[PDB]
């Protein structure tokens, strides 16, 4: 109702666009006003959903007005257009429409500035005045322009200060990161060019070195905003130092010029009066224009040689308005290379996780969304699209490239003419040679430039990042880390899920970053992080290999969490064994930093028990409430898991996972503010089901819906995978997830028996009966019986570890049923009856799936393995005495008919 009154019932000169829709809105308004008056003193929702059908063209024209509305749902579009005077529903969509902006700072009906995702504040040059009569798109457009103008103004001020000769340590505390970055890089390239005019490079090397040392010294006493800003400036300044050191080590002038041409150089025009197009980025002769979009303080990438060559080939592709293509294995830095290239070019890259459900209409709608905006599109996992869709959208991509090259103003896609912004570009990142993936046709691959990045430089990444935390020894430690990972990859059993590329090293670094608070900056921290990341994903003998190699190449309290897990296991009835508590420690320490975890083991090995009791321990430890949404993945269709677009009227119907994500994103009642949300996919890991979550699992933390919606993943939103094998699971899914491997069962036979007995008793005098039943389960004879059970022939082969469910449940239920006649007999008779009943239950639970001769053999062995009442092949209890089935046969005299 509020959305409808905002779009039509309140705005003036807006009801004449669709007079029939205006009349329908008036009739619905009268009906709903009568209903509201009756309530204050079903059919309405159906009528509203019916009248949204004519609103589709209205919403499409509204999206044409402000092109960034394409990244919003129809419900969110209704909310933002209906925000006539509240001016707060519009701020919640900044992250969806921009990516790097969280909310808008408002001050007495005026806009002061915008705030980034990381907490950075960008203050506008002039405050924007909002009136009551203005609608959203005009002041969103002027805010979009004002953000770019403010970013350029801060860049110009910082660059003037740097030209004035002041140190960067006093300007980092005054401006946003992007201004500091661009001004510092312009000064760096000017000073390096001036040094290249001569043969002298050592003086600037010393200058940059002591600048880096001063920045590292001032890092430890700065606020978190200044911490992130300084860390990104150390990334760029270490790139500067590496380039200057390489130039100094160069023997001749020509190779120095070649090395200088191989690297980015950001210049600035001094004659053009257009402020936003005054900065151009040079590489290998080509020139690319800055856009001055707000970037924020991202997690900057270390400038490896592979990253520089990738930037060079992306510039070479975009100089001719072609596409960017990155092919290789998983965890190599393709999407991150694209995003870092975009952040270097001063614009947020919009990433799309392509899927088989993305038909021609969906992909073309996303194309007209991003060409109208002018944003950069990273079509992540472009193999996953069907081959028919890949062929069909080739014409659209060719038209986009032709319009960009020839400078056309409009492009005709999806039977509608829309304007073409000249700042757009297309990037694809795909993983060739995986099972269950389509192959790109050559007519489409000729529109992209592919660049192989199979082998990243992990040593440089580790060395520079560990230097950024400030480790005293960084080169030797990084070399030891990389050698350890290589020899661990070479000296382990070659199973399908052992992957030790860049992703596990980076997870080691993310685990070592908050671990120095308890271990200190040193080798103990990195070996603890290596254990916490890598050990849970290894088997039994590979664990010994890991320990031996760790002792070879490296030299070397948590009582509260263990107490909480012990309490949780006591409440749940589990037994805190060594292996079970070890798996609990591994899961807890791995989930402390990693969001998506895959639990792998045999059937009934202890996955659900492990994560349920760790969740209980976390809830009782931190005090935070917790919700769990277990979704059986393969039971539901993909269209029922994510959602399907109804082709009858082009509306979006939310799937289950998307519905849960939207419910946790909106947070209407405020109850999801301080809670952890676990979504458990308790089924097989189908690649077609879990590679649609590729952008969800990695550091993007975003779900790219077919209808253009971009739902962010909250930090307290963790995904659990519970499967049995990883036979068909691709390495793209394995590397993104902190894996927990269950090599053996976490529970002993006696512990499982005790847990089942206690759970069955809790699910129901009682004390004496429970004691007698517990004493009757003689574990010494039970283990011999279970070992002798393994020699039978079983149909529907199930391990004997999981037949205790049937045995315990049958025994407890039959004892409870026979409890009626248990008050008028001696203790020995009761003991014999209970022993016989448990013998029968064990027989029909263990050998019940065997033949008659095998069941006779098993009843003989259970008789000889247990004075006790002997159970025969036809033993039974009548209404409480022992008898046989011979005397229980009734006489039958069938009629002819």
């Amino acid at each position: 109702w509020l959305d409808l009154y905002g779009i039509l019932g309140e705005n003036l000169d807006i009801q004449n666009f669709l007079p029939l829709e205006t009349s329908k809105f008036k009739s619905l308004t009268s009906e709903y006003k009568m209903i509201t008056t009756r309530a204050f003193q079903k059919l309405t929702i159906d009528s509203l959903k019916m009248i949204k059908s004519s609103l589709s063209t209205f919403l499409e024209r509204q999206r044409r007005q402000f092109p960034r509305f394409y990244f919003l749902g129809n419900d969110d579009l209704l909310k933002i257009i209906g925000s006539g005077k509240h001016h707060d529903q519009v701020s919640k969509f900044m992250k969806k429409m921009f990516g790097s902006i969280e909310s808008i700072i408002f001050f007495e009906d005026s806009i002061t500035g915008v705030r980034s995702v990381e907490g950075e504040v960008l203050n506008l040059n002039e405050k924007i005045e909002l009136k009551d009569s203005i609608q959203a798109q005009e002041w969103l457009n002027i805010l979009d322009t004002e953000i770019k103008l403010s970013v350029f103004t801060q860049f110009r001020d910082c660059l003037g200060q740097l030209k004035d000769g002041t140190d960067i340590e006093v300007v980092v505390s005054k401006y946003i990161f992007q201004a500091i970055l661009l001004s510092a890089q312009v000064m760096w390239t000017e000073l390096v060019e001036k040094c290249l005019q001569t043969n002298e490079f050592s003086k600037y090397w010393k200058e940059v070195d002591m600048k880096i040392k001063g920045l590292l010294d001032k890092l430890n006493k700065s606020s978190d905003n200044v911490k992130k800003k300084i860390e990104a400036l150390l990334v760029e300044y270490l790139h500067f130092n590496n380039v200057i050191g390489q130039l100094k080590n160069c023997s001749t002038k020509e190779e120095a010029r070649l090395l200088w041409a191989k690297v980015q150089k950001f210049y600035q025009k001094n004659d053009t009066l257009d402020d936003l197009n005054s900065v151009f980025i040079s590489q290998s002769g080509y020139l690319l224009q800055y856009k001055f979009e707000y970037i924020g303080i991202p997690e900057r990438l270390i400038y490896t040689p592979l990253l520089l060559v990738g930037f060079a080939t992306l510039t070479d592709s975009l100089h001719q308005k072609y596409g960017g293509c990155f092919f290789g294995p998983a965890g190599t830095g393709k999407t991150e290379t694209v995003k870092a290239f975009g952040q270097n070019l001063g614009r947020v890259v919009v990433v799309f996780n392509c899927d088989d459900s993305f038909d021609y209409q969906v992909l073309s709608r996303l194309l007209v969304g991003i060409t109208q905006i002018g944003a950069w599109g990273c079509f992540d996992e472009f193999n996953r699209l069907d081959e028919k869709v890949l062929s069909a959208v080739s014409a659209n991509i060719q038209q986009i490239q032709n319009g960009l090259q020839v400078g056309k103003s409009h492009i005709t896609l999806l039977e509608e003419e829309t304007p073409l912004s000249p700042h757009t570009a297309v990037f694809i990142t795909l993983n060739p040679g995986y099972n269950g993936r389509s192959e790109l046709p050559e007519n489409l691959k000729k529109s992209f430039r592919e660049f192989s990045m199979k082998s990243p430089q992990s040593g440089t990444i580790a060395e520079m990042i560990l230097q950024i935390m400030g480790f005293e020894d960084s080169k030797s430690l990084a070399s030891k880390i990389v050698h350890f990972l290589e020899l661990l990859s070479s000296k382990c059993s070659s199973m399908n899920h052992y992957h030790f590329g860049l992703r596990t090293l980076k997870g080691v670094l993310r685990n070592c970053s908050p671990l120095v608070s308890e271990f200190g900056e040193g080798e103990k921290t990195v070996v603890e992080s290596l254990k916490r990341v890598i050990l849970p994903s290894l088997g039994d003998t590979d664990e010994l290999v890991f320990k031996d190699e760790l002792s070879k190449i490296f030299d070397s309290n948590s009582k509260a969490i263990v107490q909480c897990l012990k309490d949780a296991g006591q409440r749940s009835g589990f037994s805190m064994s060594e292996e079970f508590l070890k798996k609990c420690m591994q899961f807890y320490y791995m989930q402390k930093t990693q969001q998506a975890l895959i639990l792998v083991g045999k059937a009934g090995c202890g996955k659900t028990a492990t994560w349920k009791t760790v969740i209980d321990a976390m809830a009782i430890f931190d005090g935070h409430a917790n919700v769990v949404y277990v979704i059986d993945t393969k039971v539901l269709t993909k269209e029922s898991l994510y959602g399907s677009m109804l082709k009858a009227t082009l509306e979006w119907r939310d799937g289950l996972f998307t519905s849960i994500l939207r419910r946790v994103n909106d947070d209407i009642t405020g109850t999801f503010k301080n809670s952890r949300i676990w979504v458990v996919f308790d089924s097989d890991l189908d690649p077609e089901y879990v590679e649609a979550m590729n952008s969800v699992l990695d550091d993007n933390k975003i779900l790219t819906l077919p209808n253009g919606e971009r739902l962010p993943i909250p930090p307290n939103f963790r995904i659990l995978f519970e499967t049995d094998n990883l036979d068909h699971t691709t390495p793209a899914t394995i590397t993104r997830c902190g894996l927990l491997w269950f090599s053996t069962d976490v529970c002993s036979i006696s512990s499982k028996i005790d847990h089942l007995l206690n759970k069955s008793y809790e699910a129901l005098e009682l004390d004496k009966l429970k004691d007698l039943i517990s004493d009757s389960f003689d574990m010494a004879s039970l283990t011999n019986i279970f070992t002798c059970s393994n020699d039978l022939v079983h149909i529907l082969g199930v391990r004997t570890f999981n037949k205790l469910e049937t045995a315990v449940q049958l025994a407890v239920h039959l004892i409870s049923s026979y409890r009626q006649w248990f008050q008028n007999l001696d203790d020995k008779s009761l003991k014999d009856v209970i022993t016989l009943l448990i013998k029968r239950s064990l027989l029909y639970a263990l050998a019940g799936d065997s033949t008659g001769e095998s069941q006779r053999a098993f009843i003989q062995t259970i008789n000889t393995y247990f004075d006790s009442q002997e159970l025969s092949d036809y033993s039974t209890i009548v209404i409480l005495s022992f008898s046989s089935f011979c005397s229980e046969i009734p006489s039958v005299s069938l009629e002819a008919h």
Binding site: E254, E255, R257, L258, A261, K262, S284, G285, Y286, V309, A312, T313, D316, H319, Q320, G328, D359, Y360, Q361, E387, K388, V389, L390, S391, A392, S394, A395, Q398, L414, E415, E439, P441, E442, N443, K445, K446, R449, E450, F451, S452, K454, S455
Partner: protein
């Protein structure tokens, strides 16, 4: 006999089936373009020229060799036929023996095969007997049919050749890829529009909308002179309908197997220094495309190098030469860029990166006198000539270049033994096919 051979090829692969309408149109074209033997000779040449383009390279040489065999067995004597059989046998490693001495052509082929030049022996029949060849342009120009289909292996496309043909004939294309309902509807509307006032239409990946292809395209081909229809299909894809295929001309686009022929093609597809750099780039692309077909020793895998790489490297060369007017052109920069960015993005193995870097070091050394191949040497441009004289000089130095019979090893600077293995396997397969074909 030729008709039975053609249906045997149609039995081999579903794309090579031959109808009677096309063959009778060829027979009419023979007269359109000792007298009965001359009519037979023109028949042989015209049928070879028409139906070579419908086959890939191995079937091209197979059909050329068996057709020359049929013609010469009709014309010549029995001893010549026995010599040809035993020479194919030693080519097929089935019968070993020197052919009987008699004219002169047999001596040339004996010298070709005794020098372990199998590719030269296979292509010598094309060199001697058939004196004409047809590309896509000649097929489209000399066809009375209104509909065309084009087949090529995966990871290679000839859409750019059709675009160049359209630009050469001053026509207009409308690229309509298939695979979705909207594309099919727009295809139907454009088909009606360009049937009622002309214009070219090209359909991409028609093996991906097979139901629509079996219904609408079949019923439309079954039932303006300035209108044409082009279709793109894959040789390793699904089976296109026989009634649809026999009613449309079939062209198989594959990369030119030669080296000097590839240089001539890339040179004909086009200051003085831009011309020189374009010449060097065309030579480099031809050499690397000749090298990439030797799977185990030429590269570590199978890589494709299409017109996009040549275009991007040419644009980079023009950008470097325009932005560096001081004439101290950074050849190290150009070498690193071409070996690392343009042609090296597809390359995933480090040994192949090393060999492409070595090739770029050989072709872009920036010396005054460069021996790019062991036979041909190119000088650097002078400072008193123009674009036209430079183009004439480079075309003249291409015309005077003669490719030797050992160009698969010496020109690529590779050991002979791998070339022997590859050429021997290829010739053995071709000769086994023609021995299974010729006896029946």
């Amino acid at each position: 006999k030729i008709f039975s051979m053609l249906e045997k090829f149609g039995q081999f692969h579903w794309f090579y089936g031959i109808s009677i309408g096309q063959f009778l149109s060829c027979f009419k074209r023979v007269f359109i373009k000792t007298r009965v033997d001359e009519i037979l000779w023109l028949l042989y040449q015209e049928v070879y020229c028409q139906f070579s383009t419908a086959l890939d390279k191995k079937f091209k040489m197979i059909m050329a060799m068996t057709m020359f065999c049929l013609y010469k067995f009709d014309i010549e004597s029995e001893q010549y036929k026995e010599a040809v059989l035993t020479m194919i046998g030693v080519l097929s490693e089935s019968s070993d023996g020197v052919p009987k001495l008699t004219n002169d052509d047999l001596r040339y082929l004996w010298d070709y095969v005794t020098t372990k030049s199998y590719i030269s022996a296979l292509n010598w029949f094309k060199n001697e007997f058939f004196v004409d060849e047809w590309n896509i342009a000649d097929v489209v120009a000399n066809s009375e049919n209104n509909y065309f289909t084009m087949a090529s292996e995966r990871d290679v496309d000839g859409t750019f050749k059709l675009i160049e043909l359209a630009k050469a004939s001053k026509e207009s294309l409308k690229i309509i890829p298939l695979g979705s309902i909207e594309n099919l509807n727009y295809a139907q509307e454009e088909i009606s529009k360009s049937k009622i006032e002309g214009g070219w239409i090209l359909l991409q990946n028609i093996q991906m909308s097979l139901s629509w292809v079996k219904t609408y395209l079949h019923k439309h081909v079954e039932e303006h002179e300035k209108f044409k229809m082009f279709m793109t299909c894959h040789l390793t894809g699904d089976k296109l309908p026989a009634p649809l295929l026999q009613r449309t001309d079939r062209v198989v686009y594959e990369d030119i197997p030669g080296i000097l022929d590839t240089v001539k093609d890339l040179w004909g597809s086009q200051g003085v220094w831009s011309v020189y750099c374009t010449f060097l780039l065309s030579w480099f692309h031809a050499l690397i495309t000749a090298r990439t077909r030797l799977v185990p020793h030429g590269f570590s895998k199978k890589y494709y190098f299409n017109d996009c790489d040549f275009q991007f490297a040419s644009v980079y060369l023009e950008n470097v030469l325009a932005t560096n007017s001081t004439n101290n052109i950074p050849w190290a920069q150009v070498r690193d860029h071409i070996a690392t960015i343009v042609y090296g993005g597809k390359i995933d193995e480090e040994k192949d990166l090393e060999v492409v870097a070595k090739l770029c070091a050989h072709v872009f050394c920036g010396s005054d006198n460069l021996q790019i191949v062991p036979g041909v040497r190119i000088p650097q441009p002078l400072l008193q000539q123009s674009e036209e004289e430079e183009r004439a000089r480079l075309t003249a130095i291409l015309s005077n270049t003669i490719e030797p019979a050992d160009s698969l090893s010496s020109w690529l600077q590779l050991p002979r033994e791998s070339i022997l293995d590859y050429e021997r396997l290829q010739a053995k397969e071709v000769a086994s096919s023609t021995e299974q074909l010729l006896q029946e």
